[PDB]
Automatic annotation (TrEMBL), chains A, B, C, D:
Name by which UniProt lists this protein: Cellulose synthase operon protein D
GO BP terms in the entry: cellulose biosynthetic process
Cross-referenced Pfam families: Cellsynth_D
Upper classification of the organism: Bacteria, Pseudomonadati, Pseudomonadota, Betaproteobacteria, Burkholderiales
Domain of life: Bacteria
InterPro entries: BcsD_bac (IPR022798), Cellsynth_D_sf (IPR038470)
Amino acid sequence: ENPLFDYYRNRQAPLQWRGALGALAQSLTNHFSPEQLRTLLREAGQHFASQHPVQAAETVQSMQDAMNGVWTTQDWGWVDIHDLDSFLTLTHYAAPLESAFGAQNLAWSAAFLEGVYEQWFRQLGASDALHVRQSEESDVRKAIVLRLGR
Amino acid sequence: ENPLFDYYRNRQAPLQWRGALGALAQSLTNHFSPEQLRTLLREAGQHFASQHPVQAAETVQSMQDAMNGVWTTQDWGWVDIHDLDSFLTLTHYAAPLESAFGAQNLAWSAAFLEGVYEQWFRQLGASDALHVRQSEESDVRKAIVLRLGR
Amino acid sequence: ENPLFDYYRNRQAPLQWRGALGALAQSLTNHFSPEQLRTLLREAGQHFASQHPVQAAETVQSMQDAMNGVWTTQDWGWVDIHDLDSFLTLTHYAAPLESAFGAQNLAWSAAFLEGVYEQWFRQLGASDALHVRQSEESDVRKAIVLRLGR
Amino acid sequence: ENPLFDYYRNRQAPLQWRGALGALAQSLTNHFSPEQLRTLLREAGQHFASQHPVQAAETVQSMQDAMNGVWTTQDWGWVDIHDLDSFLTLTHYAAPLESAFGAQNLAWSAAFLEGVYEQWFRQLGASDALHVRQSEESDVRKAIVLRLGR
């Protein structure tokens, strides 16, 4: 139940990189504030999305399928998109960020995802007035909730 | 020969983290200079060595055995230590840094190792006057050469 | 909830070996019956336990600590041992067998664990009259329950 | 040179599965003869190729590109195809079979590849008279050489 979920969350990253990435996160936290780390990881996510473009889509389900197709080739969870009235809500499950950088660093590591979807939307013809922002409403460990809005 | 060695070097990191770490390295290079990145990675290596202490050793071969025992549990290559007159030369093989952060970033990513061994020496009674420095003399891709000297 | 647990269970094995091990399991199922596969995987578990011996223990908690210390170096879940009257019950969590060989093959792949603990008990002075057997009472996906009894 | 190549070959498989697959290979060798293991792994390769079909191609370079595109998503080396007169010679580099099942088992584990390309050619309209056979002429460790012939 709780212990099994904790083990799955903590061991999602491989043995080769868990300690190294934890040490890197520790050094980053020592040198920089959480906001600077959020900016850094957002730019990293933009670069990642640039290196892994999504196929052209027209509908919400097609965009979700393209994003999940990109994700499934690297074992990075999956995204569900819901069109609530005018705004799109993106829920990402099984992001391996917690296993690598630690749970307490999810306050900034999650910004990486915020950097990806944004750029992906820029590749799908989304208006520049729209931006992706992380909503601090639900538990970050369970899922990461983002909103594409003005 | 060359292509097989290149493939082995480029694919040492798993598919789950290669793109993410490449994007993170790209963002880090965009924001900070190589010297600041070297300082950051050295502190990261110090934290990594603190989190994974080495068993007490007395001889050079025992120190090598302890360091290799720590390395082999995470698939991070191996170290050979030679005692030339007064100074110790450490040659590290098969560091997965190139596969993760890219070959062109080895100018600073290798500093991570410089941060590890240093702390490990501090754990084995090495005098504070001695420090570990990377010698820019050989090919970085083949092996990483470090000197423990004054 | 259910989808997240399913994703964690299915993606525990790396991308490098998931398809290859699934194909190997398919070929094994086509060629051999479940009982023969159980015997084969039990012998495989015995060999694995021989290659990775456990440190000598005296109490139940120390035995569990040694077994978990062996497991944690390879990301293979963890074991809880309970001494019910005269028999030991071992519950194993987060075995990556399902991610590799598929859920429907857990009827025989779990025998691998039955082969490991047995040998480990033989290394800790357990009487030859005692054997490890898998109890088909609970859900195999949630946890694997084994009994060390006569 | 030699130690680096040996380390890269022996550590291609992750820490999570190296010991388990070695134990499984030991059990398979104890129970079955090499020819039976070759048949089993050939059928496994056919199933793997069925699960991961290649895109339709017309030329030799296009077929090689499709096969390498399938391989590169799972970190399984790469293949080079040469058209010598009437027969196709396939050289596969960086197969992780040796890291998993051991070098001494490459006498049969390589049959897995023999099972894949065969089925792949069956998907590309190759005549049923043509079969893929492993040529025992070169060093298995360096590369795996296969011939598609009558």
